[PDB]
Design a protein around this ligand. Sequence first.
Ligand SMILES: Nc1nc2[nH]cnc2c(=S)[nH]1
Length: 330
Amino acid sequence: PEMVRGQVFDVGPRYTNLSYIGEGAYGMVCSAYDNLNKVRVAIKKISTYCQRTLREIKILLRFRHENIIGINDIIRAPTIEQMKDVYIVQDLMETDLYKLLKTQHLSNDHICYFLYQILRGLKYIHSANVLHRDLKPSNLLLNTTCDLKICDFGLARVADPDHDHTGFLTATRWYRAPEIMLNSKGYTKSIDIWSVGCILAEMLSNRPIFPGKHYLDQLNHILGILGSPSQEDLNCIINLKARNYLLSLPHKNKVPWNRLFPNADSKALDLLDKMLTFNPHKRIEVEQALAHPYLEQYYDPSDEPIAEAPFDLPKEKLKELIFEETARFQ
Ligand SMILES: Nc1nc2[nH]cnc2c(=S)[nH]1
């Protein structure tokens, strides 16, 4: 067994010369040489935590799309008794958008291209009636030619708008839609669109637009820029405790986008405005975002595929489910 930073990375004959890349969720990430098609790859070691592991495997194996990270191989023991670690193999990318925003100014041409590819991937995901629910810059991988792939489906769910309602004060904080702090479990597609709006804002300025320190700090940051919600938007919130909290706040005026981003393309600001809408019912959907004049140069519905079909247990059946789902790579 090759060892990496004091750890067993038992990835067999096929994958050699492992280099530490970092640690995402789940554990260690190394790159490795694949001797079957002579190209380096990324390998994640996996040791509840079982739930999100299973969820992701199940989704990523069903999805096939240029803008979604795939699964090339899965390595595990031949038997359930012997199975401890599971190794996930994926295409090696150069960087993620979070690391990129820390260090690099982006041209409008790059912002436009990135945003197109995010939406193109999201169009597919939503057509399968799946919510990602944790879109943020670190879950967006880029290769050396700026091709983009969405990763980490650990928090993903099937859409369920009939059961979205919940109480007041019930994923990553900065990219959370406002309705989540107010009356929503985040079971509708509109919460992903909000996260893309945040990512877009972050691409225009190299900084998180709403960096809340905590739950309600997040909300007052949003309202500090969007302004106090209208009576019509408030009427949509029927839970008295959410509504009366909002009514207890001082009046805030909308800060116009062109003041926050004085050198942004005006078309980008017009799309941003429609993504970061307080009322989820008024918020643009992904197909409409794709058709927006900002993305005209890329928009091509015949090259924007949709999925062919849309989508509580003891720890014993879960180990077993992971085993069964990973059998195809044996
Ligand atoms: N560079 C890099 N490439 C990847 N492919 C799948 N995951 C990764 C990560 S976390 N980093």
